[PDB]
Amino acid sequence: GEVLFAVGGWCSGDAISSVERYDPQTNEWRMVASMSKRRCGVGVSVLDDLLYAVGGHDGSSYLNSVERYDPKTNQWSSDVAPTSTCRTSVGVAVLGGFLYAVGGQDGVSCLNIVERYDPKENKWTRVASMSTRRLGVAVAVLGGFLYAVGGSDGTSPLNTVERYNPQENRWHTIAPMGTRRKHLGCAVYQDMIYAVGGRDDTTELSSAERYNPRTNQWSPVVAMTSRRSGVGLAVVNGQLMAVGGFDGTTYLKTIEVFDPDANTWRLYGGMNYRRLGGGVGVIK
């Protein structure tokens, strides 16, 4: 059974991020060990069955911090090289055994920076930058490409979608989403990229859409029950699930699971934590 981990759905005033664990087989949430470094706004992904947390900020200070969490020991380690730049709201994903850290924000601006981590060498390297500067980009990997979807330019949500080919070391701008989305969830499901929730220019979104690389098209997907900006999206035991988020009024303590046969999202209660969700990674 796969387990979902979620980092940073809540961040305390004193910069402690929540670290939550969800086992969908038993339907149990737990709090697990906090990161060693005080920080919020981390980006997370899973590499070799460890949860990596990259970047962030501690109040006004932006970080180059990297930590990795072992679910077998319930311990975070600070044994990894830091990134070369300090930045928050970075998008993280793994392609071809490297961990990529995409975009974000520092004191000065939103960023188009892309760095790659080689676990064999324990070294970060700048690779090709995105064509667009953006923070909080949602990342997904499909077909040998790394996708950078949506995000924000500092104020406004984006519909931009770019993908990176590591053999060419180049980003290419592809079909934009139908809606501008910051604070969105993105996950690969059934060989398509799903983008769910977020916030457009006017409102938090319940809407969803999916990208098919074969056709280079985004198509609308049936809406969730709730609007969810800040939503965590992941595939867990083969099921697409959206976690938490802000509906315009309040922070939600529910999840939704996509049921493609019924063509509906099924709503389930979660745990009454201060915030449910954050940056997500799935471990078996």
From Swiss-Prot:
Transmembrane segments: none
Induction: By hypoxia.
Location in or out of the cell: Cytoplasm, Perinuclear region; Nucleus; Golgi apparatus, trans-Golgi network; Cell projection, Axon
Kelch repeat extents: 3-49, 51-97, 98-144, 146-191, 193-238, 240-284
Primary role: Substrate-specific adapter of a BCR (BTB-CUL3-RBX1) E3 ubiquitin-protein ligase complex involved in interferon response and anterograde Golgi to endosome transport. The BCR(KLHL20) E3 ubiquitin ligase complex mediates the ubiquitination of DAPK1, leading to its degradation by the proteasome, thereby acting as a negative regulator of apoptosis. The BCR(KLHL20) E3 ubiquitin ligase complex also specifically mediates 'Lys-33'-linked ubiquitination.
Subunit structure: Component of the BCR(KLHL20) E3 ubiquitin ligase complex, at least composed of CUL3, KLHL20 and RBX1. Interacts with PDZ-RhoGEF/ARHGEF11, DAPK1, PML and CORO7. Interacts with F-actin. Interacts with IFN-gamma (IFNG). Interacts (via kelch repeats) with IVNS1ABP (via kelch repeats); this interaction blocks the assembly of CUL3-KLHL20 complex.
Name recorded for this polypeptide: Kelch-like protein 20
Parent-protein start and end of this portion: 317 to 600 of 609
